[PDB]
PDB file of C-alpha atoms and ligand atoms in Angstrom:
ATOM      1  CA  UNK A   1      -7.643   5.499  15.064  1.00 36.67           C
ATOM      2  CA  UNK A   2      -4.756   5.885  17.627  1.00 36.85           C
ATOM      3  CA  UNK A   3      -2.702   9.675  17.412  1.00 33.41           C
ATOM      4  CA  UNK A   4       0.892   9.844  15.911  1.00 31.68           C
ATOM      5  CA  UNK A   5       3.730  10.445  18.295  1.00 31.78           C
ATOM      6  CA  UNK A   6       3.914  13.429  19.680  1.00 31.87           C
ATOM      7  CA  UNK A   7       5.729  15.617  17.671  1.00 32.57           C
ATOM      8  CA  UNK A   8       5.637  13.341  14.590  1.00 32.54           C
ATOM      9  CA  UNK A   9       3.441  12.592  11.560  1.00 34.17           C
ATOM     10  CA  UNK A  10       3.750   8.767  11.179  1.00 32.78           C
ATOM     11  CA  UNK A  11       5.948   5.526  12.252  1.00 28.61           C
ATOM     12  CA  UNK A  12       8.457   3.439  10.650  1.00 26.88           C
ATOM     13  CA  UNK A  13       8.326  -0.164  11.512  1.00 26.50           C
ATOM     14  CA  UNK A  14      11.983  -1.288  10.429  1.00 28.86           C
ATOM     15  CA  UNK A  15      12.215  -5.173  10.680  1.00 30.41           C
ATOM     16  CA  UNK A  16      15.702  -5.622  12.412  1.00 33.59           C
ATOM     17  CA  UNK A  17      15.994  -9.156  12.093  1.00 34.52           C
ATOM     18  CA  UNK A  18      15.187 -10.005   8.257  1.00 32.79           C
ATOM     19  CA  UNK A  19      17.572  -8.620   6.830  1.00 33.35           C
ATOM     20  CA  UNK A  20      15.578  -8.348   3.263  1.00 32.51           C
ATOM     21  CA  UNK A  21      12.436  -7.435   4.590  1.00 31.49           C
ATOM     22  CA  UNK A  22      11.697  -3.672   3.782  1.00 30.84           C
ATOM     23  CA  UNK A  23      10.358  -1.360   6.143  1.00 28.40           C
ATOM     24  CA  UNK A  24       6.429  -0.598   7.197  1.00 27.36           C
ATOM     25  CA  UNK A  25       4.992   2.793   7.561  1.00 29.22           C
ATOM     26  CA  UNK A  26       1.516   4.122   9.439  1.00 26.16           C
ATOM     27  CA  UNK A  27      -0.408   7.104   9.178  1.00 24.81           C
ATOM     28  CA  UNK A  28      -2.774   8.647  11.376  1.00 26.92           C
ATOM     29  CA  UNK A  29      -4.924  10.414   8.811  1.00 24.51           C
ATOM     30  CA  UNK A  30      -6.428   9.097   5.803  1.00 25.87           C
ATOM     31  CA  UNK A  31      -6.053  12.591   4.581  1.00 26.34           C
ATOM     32  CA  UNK A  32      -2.219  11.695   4.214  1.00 25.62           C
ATOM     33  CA  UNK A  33      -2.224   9.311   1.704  1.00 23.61           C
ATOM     34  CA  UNK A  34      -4.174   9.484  -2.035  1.00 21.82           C
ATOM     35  CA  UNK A  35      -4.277   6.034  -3.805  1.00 21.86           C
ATOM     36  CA  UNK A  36      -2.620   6.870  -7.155  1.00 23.79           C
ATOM     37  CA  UNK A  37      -2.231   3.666  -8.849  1.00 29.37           C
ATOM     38  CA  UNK A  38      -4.684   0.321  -9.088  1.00 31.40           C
ATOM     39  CA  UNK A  39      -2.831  -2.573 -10.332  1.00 29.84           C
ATOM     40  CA  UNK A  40      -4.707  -5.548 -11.005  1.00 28.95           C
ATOM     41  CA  UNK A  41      -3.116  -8.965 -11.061  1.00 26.28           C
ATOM     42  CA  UNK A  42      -2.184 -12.471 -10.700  1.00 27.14           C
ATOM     43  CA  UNK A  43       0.131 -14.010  -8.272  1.00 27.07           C
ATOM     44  CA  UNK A  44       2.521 -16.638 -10.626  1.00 27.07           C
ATOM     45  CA  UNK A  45       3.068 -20.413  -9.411  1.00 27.07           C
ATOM     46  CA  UNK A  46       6.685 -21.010  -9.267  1.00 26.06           C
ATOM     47  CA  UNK A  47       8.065 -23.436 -11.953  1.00 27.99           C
TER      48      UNK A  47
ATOM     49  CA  UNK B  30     -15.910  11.515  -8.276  1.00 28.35           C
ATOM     50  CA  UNK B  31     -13.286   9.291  -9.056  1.00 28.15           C
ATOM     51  CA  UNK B  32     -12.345   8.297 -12.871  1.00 27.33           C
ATOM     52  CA  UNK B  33      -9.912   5.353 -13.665  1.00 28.15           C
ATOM     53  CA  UNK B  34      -7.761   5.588 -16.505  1.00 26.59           C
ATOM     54  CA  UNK B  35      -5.917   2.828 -18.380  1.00 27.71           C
ATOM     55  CA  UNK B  36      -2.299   2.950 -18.833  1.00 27.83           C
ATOM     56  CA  UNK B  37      -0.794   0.808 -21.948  1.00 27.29           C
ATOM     57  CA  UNK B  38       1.850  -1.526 -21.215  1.00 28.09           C
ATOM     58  CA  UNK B  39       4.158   0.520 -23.673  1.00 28.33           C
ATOM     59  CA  UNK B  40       3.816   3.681 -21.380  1.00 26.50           C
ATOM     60  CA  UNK B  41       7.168   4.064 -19.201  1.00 23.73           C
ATOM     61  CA  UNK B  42       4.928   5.195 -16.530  1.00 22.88           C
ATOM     62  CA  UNK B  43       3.416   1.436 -16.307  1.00 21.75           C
ATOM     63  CA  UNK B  44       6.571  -0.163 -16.745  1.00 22.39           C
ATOM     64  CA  UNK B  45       7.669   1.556 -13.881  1.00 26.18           C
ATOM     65  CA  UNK B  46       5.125   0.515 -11.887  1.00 26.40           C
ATOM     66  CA  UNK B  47       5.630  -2.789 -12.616  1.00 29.06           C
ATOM     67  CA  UNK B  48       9.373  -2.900 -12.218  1.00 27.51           C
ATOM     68  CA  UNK B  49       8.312  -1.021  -8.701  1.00 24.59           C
ATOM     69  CA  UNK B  50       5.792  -4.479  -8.008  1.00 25.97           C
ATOM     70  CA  UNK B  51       8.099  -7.017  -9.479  1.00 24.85           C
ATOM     71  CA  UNK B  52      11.270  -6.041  -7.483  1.00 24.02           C
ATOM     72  CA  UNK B  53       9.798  -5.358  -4.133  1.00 22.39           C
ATOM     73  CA  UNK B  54       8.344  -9.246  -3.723  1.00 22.42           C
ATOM     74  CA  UNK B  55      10.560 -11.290  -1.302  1.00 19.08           C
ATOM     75  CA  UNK B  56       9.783 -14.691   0.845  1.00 18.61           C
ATOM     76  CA  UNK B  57       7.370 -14.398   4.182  1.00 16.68           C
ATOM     77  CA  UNK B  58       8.238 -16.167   7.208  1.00 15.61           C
ATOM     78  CA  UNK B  59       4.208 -17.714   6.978  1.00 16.88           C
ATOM     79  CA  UNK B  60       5.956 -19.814   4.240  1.00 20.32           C
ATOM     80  CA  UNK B  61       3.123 -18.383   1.729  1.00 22.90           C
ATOM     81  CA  UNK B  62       0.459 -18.892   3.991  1.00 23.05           C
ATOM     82  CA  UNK B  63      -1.375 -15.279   4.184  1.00 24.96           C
ATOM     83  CA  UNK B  64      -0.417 -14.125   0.567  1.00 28.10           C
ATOM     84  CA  UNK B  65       0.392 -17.531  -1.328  1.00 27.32           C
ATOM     85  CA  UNK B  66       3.562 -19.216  -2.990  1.00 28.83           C
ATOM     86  CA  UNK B  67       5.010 -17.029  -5.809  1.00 28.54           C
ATOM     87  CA  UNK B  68       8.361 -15.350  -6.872  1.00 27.77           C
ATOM     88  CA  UNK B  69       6.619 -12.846  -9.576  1.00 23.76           C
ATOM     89  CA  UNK B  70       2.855 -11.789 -10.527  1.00 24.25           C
ATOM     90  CA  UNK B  71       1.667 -11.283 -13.453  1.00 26.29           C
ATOM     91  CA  UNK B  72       0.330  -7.636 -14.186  1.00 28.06           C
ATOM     92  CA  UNK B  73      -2.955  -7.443 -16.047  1.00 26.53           C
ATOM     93  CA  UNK B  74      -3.808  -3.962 -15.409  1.00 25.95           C
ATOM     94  CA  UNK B  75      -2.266  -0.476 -14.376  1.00 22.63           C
ATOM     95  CA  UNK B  76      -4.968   2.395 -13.701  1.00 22.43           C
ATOM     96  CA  UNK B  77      -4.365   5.998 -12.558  1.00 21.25           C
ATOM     97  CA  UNK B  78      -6.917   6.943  -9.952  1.00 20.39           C
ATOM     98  CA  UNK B  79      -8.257  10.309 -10.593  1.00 22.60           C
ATOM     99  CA  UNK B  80     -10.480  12.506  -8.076  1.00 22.25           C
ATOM    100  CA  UNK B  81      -9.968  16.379  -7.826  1.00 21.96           C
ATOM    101  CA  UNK B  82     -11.620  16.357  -5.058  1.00 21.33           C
ATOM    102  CA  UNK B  83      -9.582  13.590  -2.936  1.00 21.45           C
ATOM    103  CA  UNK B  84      -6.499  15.134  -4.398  1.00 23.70           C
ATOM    104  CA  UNK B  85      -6.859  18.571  -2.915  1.00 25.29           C
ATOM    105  CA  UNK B  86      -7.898  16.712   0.638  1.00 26.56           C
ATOM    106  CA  UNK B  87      -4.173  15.026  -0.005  1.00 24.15           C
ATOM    107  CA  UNK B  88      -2.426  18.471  -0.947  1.00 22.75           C
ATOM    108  CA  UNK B  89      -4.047  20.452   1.819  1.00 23.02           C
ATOM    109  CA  UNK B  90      -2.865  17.740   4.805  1.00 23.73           C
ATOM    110  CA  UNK B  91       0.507  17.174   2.809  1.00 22.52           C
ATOM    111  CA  UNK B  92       0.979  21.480   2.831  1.00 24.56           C
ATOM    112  CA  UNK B  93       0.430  21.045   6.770  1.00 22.29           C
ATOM    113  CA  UNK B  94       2.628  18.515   7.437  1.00 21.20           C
ATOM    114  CA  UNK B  95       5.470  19.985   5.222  1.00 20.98           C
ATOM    115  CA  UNK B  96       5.384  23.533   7.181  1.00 19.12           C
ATOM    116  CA  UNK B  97       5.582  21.865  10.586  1.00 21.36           C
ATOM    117  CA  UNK B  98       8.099  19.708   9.113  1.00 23.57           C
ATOM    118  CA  UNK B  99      10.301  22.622   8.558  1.00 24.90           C
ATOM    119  CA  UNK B 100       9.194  22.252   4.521  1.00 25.79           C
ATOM    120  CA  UNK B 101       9.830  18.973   3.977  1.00 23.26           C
ATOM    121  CA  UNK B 102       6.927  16.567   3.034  1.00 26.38           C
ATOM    122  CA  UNK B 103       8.566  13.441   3.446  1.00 27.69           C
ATOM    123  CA  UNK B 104       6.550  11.873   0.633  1.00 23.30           C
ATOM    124  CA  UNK B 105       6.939   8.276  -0.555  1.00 22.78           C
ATOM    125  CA  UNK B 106       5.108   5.945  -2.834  1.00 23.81           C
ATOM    126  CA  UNK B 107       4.276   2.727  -0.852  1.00 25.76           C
ATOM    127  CA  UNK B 108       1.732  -0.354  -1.730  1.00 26.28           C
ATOM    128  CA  UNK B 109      -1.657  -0.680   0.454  1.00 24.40           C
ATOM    129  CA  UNK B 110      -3.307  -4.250  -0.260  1.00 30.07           C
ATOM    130  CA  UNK B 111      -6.976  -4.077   1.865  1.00 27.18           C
ATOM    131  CA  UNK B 112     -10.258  -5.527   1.400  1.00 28.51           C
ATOM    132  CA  UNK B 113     -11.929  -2.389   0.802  1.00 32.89           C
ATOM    133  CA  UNK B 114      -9.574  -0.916  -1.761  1.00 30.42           C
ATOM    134  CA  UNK B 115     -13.228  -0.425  -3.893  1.00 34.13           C
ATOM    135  CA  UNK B 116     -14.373   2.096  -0.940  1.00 29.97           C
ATOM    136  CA  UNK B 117     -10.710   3.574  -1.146  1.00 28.58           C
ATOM    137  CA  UNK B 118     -10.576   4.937  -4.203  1.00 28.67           C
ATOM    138  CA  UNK B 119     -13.883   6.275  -4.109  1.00 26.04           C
ATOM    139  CA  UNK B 120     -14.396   7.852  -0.864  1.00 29.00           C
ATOM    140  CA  UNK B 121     -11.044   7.908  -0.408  1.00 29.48           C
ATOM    141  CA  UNK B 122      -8.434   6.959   3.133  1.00 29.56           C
ATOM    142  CA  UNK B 123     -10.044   7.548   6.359  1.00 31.32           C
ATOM    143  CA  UNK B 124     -10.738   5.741   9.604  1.00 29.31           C
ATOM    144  CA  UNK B 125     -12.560   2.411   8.533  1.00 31.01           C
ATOM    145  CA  UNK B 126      -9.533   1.239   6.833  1.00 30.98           C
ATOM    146  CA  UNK B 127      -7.289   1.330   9.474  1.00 34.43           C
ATOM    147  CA  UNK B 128      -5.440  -1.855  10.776  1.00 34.19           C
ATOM    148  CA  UNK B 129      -6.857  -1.975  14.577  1.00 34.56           C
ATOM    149  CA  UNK B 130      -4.423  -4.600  15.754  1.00 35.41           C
ATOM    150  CA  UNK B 131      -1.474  -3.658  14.080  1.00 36.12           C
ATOM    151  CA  UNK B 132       2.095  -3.719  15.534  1.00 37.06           C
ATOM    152  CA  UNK B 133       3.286  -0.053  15.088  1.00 36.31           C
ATOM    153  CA  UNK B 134      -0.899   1.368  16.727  1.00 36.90           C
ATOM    154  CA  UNK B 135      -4.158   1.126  14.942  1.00 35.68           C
ATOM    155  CA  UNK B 136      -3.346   3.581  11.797  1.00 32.78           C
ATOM    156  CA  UNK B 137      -3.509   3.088   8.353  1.00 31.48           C
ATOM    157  CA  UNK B 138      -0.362   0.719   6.936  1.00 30.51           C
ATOM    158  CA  UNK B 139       1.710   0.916   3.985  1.00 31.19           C
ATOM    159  CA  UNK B 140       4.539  -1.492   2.839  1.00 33.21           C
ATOM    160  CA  UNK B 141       7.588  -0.947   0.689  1.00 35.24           C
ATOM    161  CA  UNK B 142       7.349  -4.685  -0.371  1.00 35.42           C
ATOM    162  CA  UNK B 143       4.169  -5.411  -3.042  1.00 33.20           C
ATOM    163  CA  UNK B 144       4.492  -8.656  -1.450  1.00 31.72           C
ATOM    164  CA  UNK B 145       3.400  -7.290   2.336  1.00 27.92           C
ATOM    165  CA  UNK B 146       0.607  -5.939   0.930  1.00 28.13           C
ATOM    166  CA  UNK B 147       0.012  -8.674  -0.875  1.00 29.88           C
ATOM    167  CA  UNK B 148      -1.104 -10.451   2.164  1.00 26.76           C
ATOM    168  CA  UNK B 149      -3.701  -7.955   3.051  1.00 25.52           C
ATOM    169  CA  UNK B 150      -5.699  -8.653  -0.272  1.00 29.85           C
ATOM    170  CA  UNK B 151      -7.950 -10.370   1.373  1.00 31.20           C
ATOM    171  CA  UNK B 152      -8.025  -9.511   4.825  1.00 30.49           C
ATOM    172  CA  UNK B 153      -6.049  -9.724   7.979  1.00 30.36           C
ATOM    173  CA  UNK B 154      -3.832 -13.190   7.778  1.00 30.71           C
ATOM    174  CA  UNK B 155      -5.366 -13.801   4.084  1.00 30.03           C
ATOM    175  CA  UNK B 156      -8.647 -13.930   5.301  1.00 27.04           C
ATOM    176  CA  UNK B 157     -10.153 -17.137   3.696  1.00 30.82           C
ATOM    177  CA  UNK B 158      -8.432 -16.347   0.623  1.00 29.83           C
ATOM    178  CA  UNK B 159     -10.420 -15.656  -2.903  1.00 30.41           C
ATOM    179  CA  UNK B 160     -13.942 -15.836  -2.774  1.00 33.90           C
ATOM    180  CA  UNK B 161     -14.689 -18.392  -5.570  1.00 31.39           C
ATOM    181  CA  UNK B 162     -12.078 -21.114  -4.238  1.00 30.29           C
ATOM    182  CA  UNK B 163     -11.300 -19.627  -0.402  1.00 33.31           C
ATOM    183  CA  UNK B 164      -8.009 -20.427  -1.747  1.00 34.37           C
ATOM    184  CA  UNK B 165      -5.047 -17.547  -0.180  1.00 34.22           C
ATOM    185  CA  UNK B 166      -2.832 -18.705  -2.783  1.00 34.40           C
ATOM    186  CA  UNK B 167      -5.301 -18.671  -5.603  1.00 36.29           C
ATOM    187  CA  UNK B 168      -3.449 -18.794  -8.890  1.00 37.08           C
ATOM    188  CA  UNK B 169      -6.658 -17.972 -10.921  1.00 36.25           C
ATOM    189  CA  UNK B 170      -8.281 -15.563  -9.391  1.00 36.69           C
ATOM    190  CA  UNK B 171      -7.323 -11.816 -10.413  1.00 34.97           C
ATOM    191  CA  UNK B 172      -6.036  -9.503  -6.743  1.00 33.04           C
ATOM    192  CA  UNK B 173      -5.907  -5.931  -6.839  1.00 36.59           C
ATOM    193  CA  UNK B 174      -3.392  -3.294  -4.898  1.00 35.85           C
ATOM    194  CA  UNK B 175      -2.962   0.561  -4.648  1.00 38.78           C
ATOM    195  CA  UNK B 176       0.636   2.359  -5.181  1.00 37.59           C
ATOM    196  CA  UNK B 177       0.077   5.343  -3.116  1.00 36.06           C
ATOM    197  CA  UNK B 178       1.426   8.442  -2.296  1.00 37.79           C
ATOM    198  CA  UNK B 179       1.823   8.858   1.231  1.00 39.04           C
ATOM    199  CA  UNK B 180       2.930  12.187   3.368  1.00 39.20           C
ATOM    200  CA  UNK B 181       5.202  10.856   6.261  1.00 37.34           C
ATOM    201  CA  UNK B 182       6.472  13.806   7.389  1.00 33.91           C
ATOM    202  CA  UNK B 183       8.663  13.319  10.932  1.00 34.64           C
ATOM    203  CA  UNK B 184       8.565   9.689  11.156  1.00 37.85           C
ATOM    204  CA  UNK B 185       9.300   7.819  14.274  1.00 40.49           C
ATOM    205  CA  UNK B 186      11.247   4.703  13.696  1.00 39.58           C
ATOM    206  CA  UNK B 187      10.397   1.834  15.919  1.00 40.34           C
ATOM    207  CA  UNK B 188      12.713  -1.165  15.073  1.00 40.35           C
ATOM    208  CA  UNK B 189      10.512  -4.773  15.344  1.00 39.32           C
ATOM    209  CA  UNK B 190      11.519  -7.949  15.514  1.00 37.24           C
ATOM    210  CA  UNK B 191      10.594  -9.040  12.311  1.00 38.75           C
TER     211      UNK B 191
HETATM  212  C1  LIG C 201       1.118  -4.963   9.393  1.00 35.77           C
HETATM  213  O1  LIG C 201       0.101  -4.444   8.483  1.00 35.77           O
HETATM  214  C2  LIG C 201       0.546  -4.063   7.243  1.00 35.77           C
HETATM  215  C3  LIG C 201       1.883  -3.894   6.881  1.00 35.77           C
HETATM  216  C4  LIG C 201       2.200  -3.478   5.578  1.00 35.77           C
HETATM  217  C5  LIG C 201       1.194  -3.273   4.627  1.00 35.77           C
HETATM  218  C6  LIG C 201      -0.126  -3.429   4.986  1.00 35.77           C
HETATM  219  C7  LIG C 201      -1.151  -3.241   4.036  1.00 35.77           C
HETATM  220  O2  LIG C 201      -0.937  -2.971   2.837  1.00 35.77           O
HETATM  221  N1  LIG C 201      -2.444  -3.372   4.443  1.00 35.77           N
HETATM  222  C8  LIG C 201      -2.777  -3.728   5.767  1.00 35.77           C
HETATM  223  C9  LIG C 201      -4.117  -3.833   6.168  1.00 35.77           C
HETATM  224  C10 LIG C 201      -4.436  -4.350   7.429  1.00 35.77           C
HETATM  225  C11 LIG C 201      -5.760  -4.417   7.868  1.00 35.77           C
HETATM  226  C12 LIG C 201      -6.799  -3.955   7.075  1.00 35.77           C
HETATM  227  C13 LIG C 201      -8.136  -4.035   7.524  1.00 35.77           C
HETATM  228  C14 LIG C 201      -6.502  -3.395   5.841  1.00 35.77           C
HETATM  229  C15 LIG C 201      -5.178  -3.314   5.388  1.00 35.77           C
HETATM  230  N2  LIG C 201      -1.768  -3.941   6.646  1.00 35.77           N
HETATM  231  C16 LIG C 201      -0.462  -3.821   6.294  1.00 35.77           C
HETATM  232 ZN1  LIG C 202      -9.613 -18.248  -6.637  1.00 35.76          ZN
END
């Protein structure tokens, strides 16, 4: 696993040309995140 | 350990989950091809994920990176779609389930669309899609993702072309 930035705790990967796509995040340490919710499902066919 | 606990469907606390999965899904440039072809999902299950344990790893690190944040946390809930979201919940985040070749550095990723981590469900690019049909826009087959909590703290923003 790589290091943050210097000086900072993750990164922000903000897609500047799709204008509807949302932004990405990475940590650097598993010890930063804590997997709250499992949501099982089904992806839908479009009708 | 970990214990998983049911929420109903007439809990606010899943309904906002699922508003939180439902209005996050948008198109993919791939046209479908990592994730599938679909506008909506249909939610069969919403479990919390309980381990004291794995929790106090999470408040300790998020304590940490508050102070040398000047007290501020910087805490989101983001989606995580993986292959080994079984070994995640029990052992909890840690090196093996980093994405080596991504983007932003090999670190652990996190998306604010369900749909992004969607594609991850099974594997890098879709994998081969589900098991039982190798199928990566299997309409059958149930998928599972996580709705984390996730300390950011100072965050460097690195604009992609995306
Ligand atoms: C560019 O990689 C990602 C962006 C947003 C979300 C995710 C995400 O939810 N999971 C993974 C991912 C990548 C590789 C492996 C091995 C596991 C998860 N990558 C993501
Ligand atoms: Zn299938």
């Amino acid at each position: 696993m790589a290091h943050s930035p210097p000086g900072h705790h993750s990164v922000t990967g903000r897609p500047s040309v799709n204008g509807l796509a949302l932004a990405e995040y990475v940590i650097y340490r598993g010890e930063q995140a804590y997997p709250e919710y499992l949501i099982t499902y089904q992806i839908m066919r479009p009708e | 350990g970990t214990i998983l606990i049911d929420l109903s469907p007439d809990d606010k606390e899943f309904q906002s989950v699922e508003e939180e999965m439902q209005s996050t899904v948008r198109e993919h440039r791939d046209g479908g091809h990592a994730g599938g072809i679909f506008n909506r999902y249909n939610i069969l299950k919403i479990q919390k994920v309980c381990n004291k344990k794995l929790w106090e790893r999470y408040t300790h690190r998020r304590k940490e990176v508050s102070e040398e944040n000047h007290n501020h946390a910087n805490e989101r809930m983001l989606f995580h779609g993986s292959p080994f979201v079984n070994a995640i919940i029990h052992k909890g985040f840690d090196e093996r389930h980093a994405y080596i070749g991504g983007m932003f550095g090999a670190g652990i990723y996190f998306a604010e669309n369900s749909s992004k981590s969607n594609q991850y469900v099974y594997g890098i690019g879709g994998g081969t899609g589900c098991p039982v049909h190798k199928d990566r826009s299997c309409y059958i087959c149930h998928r599972q993702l996580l709705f984390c909590r996730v300390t950011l703290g100072k965050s460097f923003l690195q604009f992609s072309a995306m």
